[PDB]
Design a protein around this motif. Structure first.
Motif, PDB file in Angstrom:
ATOM      1  N   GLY A  63       7.548   7.643 -67.257  1.00  0.00           N
ATOM      2  CA  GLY A  63       6.772   8.859 -67.445  1.00  0.00           C
ATOM      3  C   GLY A  63       6.231   9.453 -66.173  1.00  0.00           C
ATOM      4  N   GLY A  64       5.767  10.705 -66.294  1.00  0.00           N
ATOM      5  CA  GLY A  64       5.178  11.404 -65.175  1.00  0.00           C
ATOM      6  C   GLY A  64       6.192  11.916 -64.174  1.00  0.00           C
ATOM      7  N   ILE A  65       5.735  12.190 -62.966  1.00  0.00           N
ATOM      8  CA  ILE A  65       6.469  12.792 -61.880  1.00  0.00           C
ATOM      9  C   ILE A  65       6.550  11.734 -60.791  1.00  0.00           C
ATOM     10  CG2 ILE A  65       6.578  14.633 -60.188  1.00  0.00           C
ATOM     11  CD1 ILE A  65       4.970  16.433 -62.030  1.00  0.00           C
ATOM     12  N   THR A  66       7.726  11.614 -60.197  1.00  0.00           N
ATOM     13  CA  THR A  66       7.932  10.705 -59.096  1.00  0.00           C
ATOM     14  C   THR A  66       8.234  11.440 -57.801  1.00  0.00           C
ATOM     15  OG1 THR A  66      10.270  10.450 -59.610  1.00  0.00           O
ATOM     16  CG2 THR A  66       8.743   8.967 -60.695  1.00  0.00           C
ATOM     17  N   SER A  67       7.924  10.773 -56.690  1.00  0.00           N
ATOM     18  CA  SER A  67       8.255  11.308 -55.389  1.00  0.00           C
ATOM     19  C   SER A  67       8.535  10.198 -54.385  1.00  0.00           C
ATOM     20  CB  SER A  67       7.116  12.189 -54.841  1.00  0.00           C
ATOM     21  OG  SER A  67       7.467  12.737 -53.580  1.00  0.00           O
ATOM     22  N   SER A  68       9.454  10.485 -53.489  1.00  0.00           N
ATOM     23  CA  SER A  68       9.672   9.727 -52.268  1.00  0.00           C
ATOM     24  C   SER A  68       8.662  10.222 -51.241  1.00  0.00           C
ATOM     25  CB  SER A  68      11.101   9.880 -51.781  1.00  0.00           C
ATOM     26  OG  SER A  68      12.045   9.438 -52.751  1.00  0.00           O
ATOM     27  N   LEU A  69       8.553   9.473 -50.119  1.00  0.00           N
ATOM     28  CA  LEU A  69       7.668   9.883 -49.057  1.00  0.00           C
ATOM     29  C   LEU A  69       8.383  10.656 -47.953  1.00  0.00           C
ATOM     30  CD1 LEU A  69       5.544   6.660 -48.571  1.00  0.00           C
ATOM     31  CD2 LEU A  69       5.220   8.582 -50.185  1.00  0.00           C
ATOM     32  N   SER A  70       7.739  11.743 -47.504  1.00  0.00           N
ATOM     33  CA  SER A  70       8.215  12.474 -46.337  1.00  0.00           C
ATOM     34  C   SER A  70       7.602  11.918 -45.056  1.00  0.00           C
ATOM     35  CB  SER A  70       7.897  13.966 -46.455  1.00  0.00           C
ATOM     36  OG  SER A  70       6.524  14.223 -46.605  1.00  0.00           O
ATOM     37  N   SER A  71       6.363  11.444 -45.136  1.00  0.00           N
ATOM     38  CA  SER A  71       5.684  10.920 -43.964  1.00  0.00           C
ATOM     39  C   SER A  71       4.556   9.992 -44.379  1.00  0.00           C
ATOM     40  CB  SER A  71       5.112  12.034 -43.107  1.00  0.00           C
ATOM     41  OG  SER A  71       4.047  12.768 -43.676  1.00  0.00           O
ATOM     42  N   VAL A  72       4.211   9.166 -43.428  1.00  0.00           N
ATOM     43  CA  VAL A  72       3.060   8.274 -43.492  1.00  0.00           C
ATOM     44  C   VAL A  72       2.159   8.403 -42.271  1.00  0.00           C
ATOM     45  CG1 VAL A  72       2.439   5.831 -43.519  1.00  0.00           C
ATOM     46  CG2 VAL A  72       4.356   6.658 -44.893  1.00  0.00           C
ATOM     47  N   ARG A  73       0.864   8.572 -42.493  1.00  0.00           N
ATOM     48  CA  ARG A  73      -0.112   8.673 -41.422  1.00  0.00           C
ATOM     49  C   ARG A  73      -1.145   7.603 -41.682  1.00  0.00           C
ATOM     50  NH1 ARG A  73      -2.462  12.793 -37.728  1.00  0.00           N
ATOM     51  NH2 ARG A  73      -1.062  14.402 -38.637  1.00  0.00           N
ATOM     52  N   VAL A  74      -1.130   6.543 -40.915  1.00  0.00           N
ATOM     53  CA  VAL A  74      -2.197   5.544 -40.966  1.00  0.00           C
ATOM     54  C   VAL A  74      -3.441   5.996 -40.205  1.00  0.00           C
ATOM     55  CG1 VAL A  74      -2.622   3.129 -40.244  1.00  0.00           C
ATOM     56  CG2 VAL A  74      -0.430   3.775 -41.181  1.00  0.00           C
ATOM     57  N   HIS A  75      -4.661   5.671 -40.596  1.00  0.00           N
ATOM     58  CA  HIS A  75      -5.859   5.979 -39.818  1.00  0.00           C
ATOM     59  C   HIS A  75      -5.640   5.556 -38.354  1.00  0.00           C
ATOM     60  CE1 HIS A  75     -10.137   6.149 -38.411  1.00  0.00           C
ATOM     61  NE2 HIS A  75     -10.349   6.823 -39.523  1.00  0.00           N
ATOM     62  N   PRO A  76      -5.883   6.404 -37.351  1.00  0.00           N
ATOM     63  CA  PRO A  76      -5.561   6.098 -35.949  1.00  0.00           C
ATOM     64  C   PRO A  76      -6.144   4.797 -35.429  1.00  0.00           C
ATOM     65  CG  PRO A  76      -7.003   8.029 -36.145  1.00  0.00           C
ATOM     66  CD  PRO A  76      -6.487   7.738 -37.529  1.00  0.00           C
ATOM     67  N   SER A  77      -7.287   4.380 -35.844  1.00  0.00           N
ATOM     68  CA  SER A  77      -8.078   3.196 -35.562  1.00  0.00           C
ATOM     69  C   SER A  77      -8.026   2.121 -36.640  1.00  0.00           C
ATOM     70  CB  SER A  77      -9.532   3.593 -35.215  1.00  0.00           C
ATOM     71  OG  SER A  77      -9.567   4.248 -33.946  1.00  0.00           O
ATOM     72  N   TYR A  78      -7.063   2.165 -37.562  1.00  0.00           N
ATOM     73  CA  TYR A  78      -6.826   1.052 -38.483  1.00  0.00           C
ATOM     74  C   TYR A  78      -6.773  -0.214 -37.630  1.00  0.00           C
ATOM     75  CZ  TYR A  78      -4.418  -1.990 -41.774  1.00  0.00           C
ATOM     76  OH  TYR A  78      -4.033  -3.051 -42.569  1.00  0.00           O
ATOM     77  N   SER A  79      -7.722  -1.149 -37.781  1.00  0.00           N
ATOM     78  CA  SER A  79      -7.800  -2.355 -36.974  1.00  0.00           C
ATOM     79  C   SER A  79      -8.297  -3.530 -37.846  1.00  0.00           C
ATOM     80  CB  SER A  79      -8.713  -2.286 -35.771  1.00  0.00           C
ATOM     81  OG  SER A  79      -9.432  -1.142 -35.412  1.00  0.00           O
ATOM     82  N   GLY A  80      -7.434  -4.526 -38.032  1.00  0.00           N
ATOM     83  CA  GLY A  80      -7.778  -5.611 -38.941  1.00  0.00           C
ATOM     84  C   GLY A  80      -7.813  -5.097 -40.367  1.00  0.00           C
ATOM     85  N   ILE A  87      -2.682   8.351 -45.201  1.00  0.00           N
ATOM     86  CA  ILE A  87      -2.276   9.575 -45.883  1.00  0.00           C
ATOM     87  C   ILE A  87      -0.760   9.621 -46.008  1.00  0.00           C
ATOM     88  CG2 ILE A  87      -2.060  12.064 -45.549  1.00  0.00           C
ATOM     89  CD1 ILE A  87      -4.786  11.404 -46.628  1.00  0.00           C
ATOM     90  N   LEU A  88      -0.276   9.778 -47.236  1.00  0.00           N
ATOM     91  CA  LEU A  88       1.159   9.864 -47.511  1.00  0.00           C
ATOM     92  C   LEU A  88       1.501  11.317 -47.858  1.00  0.00           C
ATOM     93  CD1 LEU A  88       1.540   6.821 -49.941  1.00  0.00           C
ATOM     94  CD2 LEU A  88       1.219   6.799 -47.452  1.00  0.00           C
ATOM     95  N   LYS A  89       2.596  11.798 -47.319  1.00  0.00           N
ATOM     96  CA  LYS A  89       3.083  13.111 -47.668  1.00  0.00           C
ATOM     97  C   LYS A  89       4.324  12.950 -48.566  1.00  0.00           C
ATOM     98  CE  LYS A  89      -0.149  15.554 -45.759  1.00  0.00           C
ATOM     99  NZ  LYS A  89      -0.866  16.835 -45.719  1.00  0.00           N
ATOM    100  N   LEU A  90       4.361  13.750 -49.610  1.00  0.00           N
ATOM    101  CA  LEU A  90       5.359  13.635 -50.661  1.00  0.00           C
ATOM    102  C   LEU A  90       6.496  14.633 -50.521  1.00  0.00           C
ATOM    103  CD1 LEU A  90       3.076  13.156 -53.775  1.00  0.00           C
ATOM    104  CD2 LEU A  90       3.841  11.475 -52.103  1.00  0.00           C
ATOM    105  N   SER A  91       7.742  14.188 -50.684  1.00  0.00           N
ATOM    106  CA  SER A  91       8.791  15.215 -50.668  1.00  0.00           C
ATOM    107  C   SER A  91       8.982  15.961 -51.984  1.00  0.00           C
ATOM    108  CB  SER A  91      10.127  14.613 -50.253  1.00  0.00           C
ATOM    109  OG  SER A  91      10.338  13.433 -50.948  1.00  0.00           O
ATOM    110  N   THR A  92       8.426  15.466 -53.083  1.00  0.00           N
ATOM    111  CA  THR A  92       8.380  16.180 -54.349  1.00  0.00           C
ATOM    112  C   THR A  92       6.918  16.527 -54.608  1.00  0.00           C
ATOM    113  OG1 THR A  92      10.295  15.083 -55.356  1.00  0.00           O
ATOM    114  CG2 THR A  92       8.756  16.105 -56.841  1.00  0.00           C
ATOM    115  N   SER A  93       6.609  17.821 -54.762  1.00  0.00           N
ATOM    116  CA  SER A  93       5.233  18.199 -55.087  1.00  0.00           C
ATOM    117  C   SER A  93       4.850  17.782 -56.485  1.00  0.00           C
ATOM    118  CB  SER A  93       5.017  19.711 -54.903  1.00  0.00           C
ATOM    119  OG  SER A  93       5.303  20.033 -53.564  1.00  0.00           O
ATOM    120  N   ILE A  94       3.582  17.472 -56.641  1.00  0.00           N
ATOM    121  CA  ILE A  94       3.046  17.053 -57.927  1.00  0.00           C
ATOM    122  C   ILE A  94       1.995  18.046 -58.402  1.00  0.00           C
ATOM    123  CG2 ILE A  94       1.896  15.142 -59.090  1.00  0.00           C
ATOM    124  CD1 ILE A  94       3.344  13.244 -57.307  1.00  0.00           C
ATOM    125  N   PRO A  95       2.387  19.023 -59.208  1.00  0.00           N
ATOM    126  CA  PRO A  95       1.466  20.070 -59.625  1.00  0.00           C
ATOM    127  C   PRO A  95       0.378  19.548 -60.537  1.00  0.00           C
ATOM    128  CG  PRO A  95       3.708  20.802 -59.963  1.00  0.00           C
ATOM    129  CD  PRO A  95       3.746  19.299 -59.714  1.00  0.00           C
TER     130      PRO A  95
END
Length: 224
Positions: A63-80, A87-95
């Motif tokens: 069920g629902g809407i599926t999407s692959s990822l266009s991009s991934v942005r980890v927090h710049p200071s992700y540490s431990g 933040i994930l960007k989707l190649s299929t929009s989810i209205p």
């Protein structure tokens, strides 16, 4: 989710399941039609192609809407365990509309208040070390745990103000493996965190730890 109940249709209109290699992996929160907020540790360094998002369903398989990822942005200071957002960007929009909605973020500069009631949801394990993985979404309500108690449990070095904690002092209610990245909301359904880490699941005296939306608005608002 440990100690939880079945979610009802429409309880978290923004929640997404995130599969990896076609099997269960994490949760996330739909911020807008092409953007998901999840934990950094769900995606950081993994092949982005292994991931699919599903929105608009209580089920993580159907069920629902599926999407692959266009991009991934980890927090710049992700540490431990710290700054555990991506933040994930989707190649299929989810209205939005119908059954899908977008998360309302906690106020900038806000910290969840100790003792207040929070609700966490996901498709993770139902016990620490558990082998089964719910197909339909579960949820549980737990109090915020003061950061001082959290520091007592994990050590002052392990808990930052980019994290907050939640759980019950006798144990038994928590997020668990496969819930990472999914939402924790306040009693109004405002998104206050993402499932992040802990020592086991539902242990008395080891609270679940969550990445704090209130503390990380600057990252979220810039890339969302």
């Amino acid at each position: 989710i440990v100690g939880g109940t079945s979610a009802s249709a429409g309880d978290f209109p923004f929640i997404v399941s995130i599969s990896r290699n076609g099997g269960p992996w994490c949760g996330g929160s739909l911020l807008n039609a092409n953007t998901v907020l999840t934990a950094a540790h769900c995606v950081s360094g993994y092949a982005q192609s292994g991931f699919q998002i599903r929105a608009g369903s209580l089920s993580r398989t159907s069920g629902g809407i599926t999407s692959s990822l266009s991009s991934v942005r980890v927090h710049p200071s992700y540490s431990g365990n710290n700054n555990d957002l991506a933040i994930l960007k989707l190649s299929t929009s989810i209205p939005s509309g119908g059954n899908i909605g977008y998360a309302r973020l906690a106020a900038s500069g806000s910290d969840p208040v100790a003792g207040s009631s929070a609700t966490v949801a996901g498709w993770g394990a139902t016990s620490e070390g558990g082998s089964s993985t719910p197909v339909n979404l579960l949820k549980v309500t737990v109090p915020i745990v003061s950061r001082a108690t959290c520091r007592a449990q994990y050590g002052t070095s392990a808990i930052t103000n980019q994290m907050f904690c939640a759980g019950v002092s006798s144990g038994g209610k928590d997020s668990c493996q496969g819930d990472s990245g999914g939402p924790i909301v306040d009693s109004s359904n405002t998104l206050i965190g993402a499932v992040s880490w802990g020592n086991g699941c539902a242990r008395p005296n080891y609270s679940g730890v969550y990445a704090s939306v209130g503390a990380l608005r600057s990252f979220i608002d810039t890339y969302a």
